[PDB]
Amino acid sequence: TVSNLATMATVTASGREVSSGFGPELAADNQDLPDNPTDKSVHNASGASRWSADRGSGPWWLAYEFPGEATISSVNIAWGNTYATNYSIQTSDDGSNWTDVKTGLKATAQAQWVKTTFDTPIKTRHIRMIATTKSQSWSLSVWEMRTMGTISAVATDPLSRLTPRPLYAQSADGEAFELKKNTCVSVSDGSLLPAVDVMRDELGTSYGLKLAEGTNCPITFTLDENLDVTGHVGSAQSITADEAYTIVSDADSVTVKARSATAGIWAAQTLLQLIGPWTNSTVKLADVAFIPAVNIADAPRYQWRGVLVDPARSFYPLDEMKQMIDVMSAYKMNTLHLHLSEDEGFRVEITNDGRADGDTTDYTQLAIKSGAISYQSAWTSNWSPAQDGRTGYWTQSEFIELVAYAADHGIAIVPEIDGPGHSFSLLHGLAELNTGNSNPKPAAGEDTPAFIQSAQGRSSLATDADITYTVLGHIMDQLDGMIDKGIKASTMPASELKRMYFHLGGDELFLSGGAGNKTERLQEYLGRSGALVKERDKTTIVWNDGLDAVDQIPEGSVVQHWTGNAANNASIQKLLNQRNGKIIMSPAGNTYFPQRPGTETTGVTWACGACTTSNFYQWNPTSSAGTTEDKVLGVEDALWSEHLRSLNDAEFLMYTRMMATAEVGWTQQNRKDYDNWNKRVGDIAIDLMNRGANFHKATEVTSWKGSYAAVDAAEQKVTDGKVLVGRYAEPGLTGTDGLSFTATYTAEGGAVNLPVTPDMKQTYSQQQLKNGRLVVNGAHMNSIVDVYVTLPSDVLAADSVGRLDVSVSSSTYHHHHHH
Ligand SMILES: CC(=O)N[C@H]1/C(=N/OC(=O)Nc2ccccc2)O[C@H](COS(=O)(=O)O)[C@@H](O)[C@@H]1O
Ligand SMILES: CC(=O)N[C@H]1/C(=N/OC(=O)Nc2ccccc2)O[C@H](COS(=O)(=O)O)[C@@H](O)[C@@H]1O
Ligand SMILES: [Ca+2]
């Protein structure tokens, strides 16, 4: 049973003819047309039950806000003596961002009912008529907009942004918690200060929040090694309680309990999402930050939630690695897998300190010789950038700082030194490694083999030579030492952050050719290498295509699955079922970021054609592995850098598909919903534009939205009356002309239109090609719009009195802001 929901709506319009009568609300009073409605004396009676709109260029719009979720079957509009000749009906969840539901609507006569039926009733909190053209110069006339449907009295859910989707979250009773400049934070333990620093690094710049450590503060962080959220874990659900946290907030207090220092950071990242997608603003905003009153109990399905980053094909400087860590942490990723060595590079300094007795190998040449090679454009005849890979390596100091920064964001480092294949950087770097059955051999009297095309995919370390395992052993110790120095500096506990795993690789031995005995090479190498890991009290990881050595690697070893169907992989099932192993899932088609993110893009096509956010979201790692939940550690995205030459171009591939993997890592199988996730991307995107992080503007995402934030104008330089008062964030702007910015000045003395200057440093571009080859940084997101007004002179030097009125209008966005 439907009804005209107009009578309980809060009505807004683009404007109105006269302040006296003909107000927008008179479209919403559910009154049947009067007798002789076309008569000037009926239509223009001072009390006629119709909206008379503003004049000017338009567009003219009439918007209803419903006290709840409306289910609308149809919209019936009784047009007056001036009718819309072109108009649309749009919905909004937030009241600022409008989506077309029906376009190409026309009235064709005065006092005419035009009925728009939805083939499926639409659920929304807002509906609006927007008209571009009308039948006369007279104000547009609406006797009635009847919105026929049912209302459900459900409030807006301020928990609706949280990604990943938490285990339990509900609104709590009362007003939200207001953050003031002096709001301090109390911690039960010093290992929770990294959680508070994460909040401080964002809220410091954005809202001017010091968040000083204090005693008896209204925001508390309590470490509780027994914190129990299993009350919220259904029979069909599964968690890793070590990363469990609860948040209970109200108008006076925010109470965080965390099972670990790691979960403290998770709790912090949830609070930052709740505050909103402007917390990473680079300018102090004018609006106050709120934490809504909520009740959260959260923990991740999977304990292993990672990204493989490959600097080996193309180096990433430390500052870029930090920028990836920030966004990994923001989505509660807890593992940074460093593929440090390849056929085309070694990316970390290894010194000659603390070698075994008898070991005179010069390890300094590894970085010196193989840090100065990279992926070669010329050895591709495709779309790959004209530029070779970035050369270089992290010094020991930088790598330690890399570890400390990861740790302070709750992310552990897992090193990979890939062998016995994908090992050419090791043979090119160390003369001593060129011995035994190593492939290829150096040329006559050359102590290292040449970096030439013929080496790629044919590398093998000497699986039969002692020196291979001596050198491997020394690299593991140096990595070990630098990671321990990294964690120490972090103040995070070694007991959470020191990941006792070493990744040996074992993938694609001799995929392009080589010297034969592929299986014998694998079994010997991963056997002996496996023992190096076991003796260092670590668990071995190998790629699934290395499980020729399934019997040789230690009991309880881990496979990282990436190629084929793990569920029907005999060697995977034997390791899981016969050798108490475990699995990390990185099936290419769901986790490999170089797989092109869309059919409009240029990139790798073999896994799916385009592996979209659907391919990254819509899979069950445990079912895909064909094993039981207990035997699945979790997941890893893979950033392989054959074709990657900048952070910007990496971020294009990483985002927002990484936020899908984060949800696969963390959220319960039965709380997964792709459409629900898809809806949350718009705010994810607003936060990314604030971070200055790039992302693919994927066509399957339907939640691309705009957002306005007032700037704290008192912190801004006035230059010639001109000052930054606002910022507008929307993915995909090729310019600002589609937006109309207006501002008015008034003091407590003297109404005056101020000149607005919208300033967007950069426009949105998709991938650009030159001579068939990807241009580096071709694909980039438009900037956030800096909204400047020019104040008059009389008001350039008037102390603050001056409240400002800023309006932003597009076909798909409207906001009026006031402070
Ligand atoms: C404020 C108002 O009522 N404006 C309406 C209007 N203005 O015209 C007059 O009121 N003028 C007038 C006419 C007769 C005697 C004395 C004065 O006319 C607009 C056009 O309406 S229509 O001809 O019926 O199409 C109307 O849209 C304005 O709201
Ligand atoms: C563990 C891993 O992924 N190894 C390499 C890799 N695997 O090779 C393939 O992708 N195989 C393949 C390629 C084309 C046709 C048929 C099979 O791929 C990584 C690159 O990933 S991708 O660009 O998304 O393909 C590579 O960097 C790894 O060394
Ligand atoms: Ca009416």
From TrEMBL:
Region called Disordered, residue ranges: 17-55
Residue positions of the active site: 508 (proton donor)
GO MF term set: beta-N-acetylhexosaminidase activity; metal ion binding
Reactions performed catalytically: Hydrolysis of terminal non-reducing N-acetyl-D-hexosamine residues in N-acetyl-beta-D-hexosaminides
Cysteine-cysteine disulfides: 184-217, 608-611
Residues covered by the F5/8 type C domain: 1-150
Enzyme class: hydrolase
Enzyme Commission number, as recorded: 3.2.1.52
Keywords: Calcium, Glycosidase, Hydrolase, Membrane, Metal-binding, Signal, Transmembrane, Transmembrane helix
Binding-site residues for Ca(2+), renumbered to this chain: 26, 29, 49, 143-144
Entry GO CC: membrane
GO biological process: carbohydrate metabolic process; glycosaminoglycan metabolic process
Family from the record: Belongs to the glycosyl hydrolase 20 family.
Name of the protein this chain belongs to: beta-N-acetylhexosaminidase
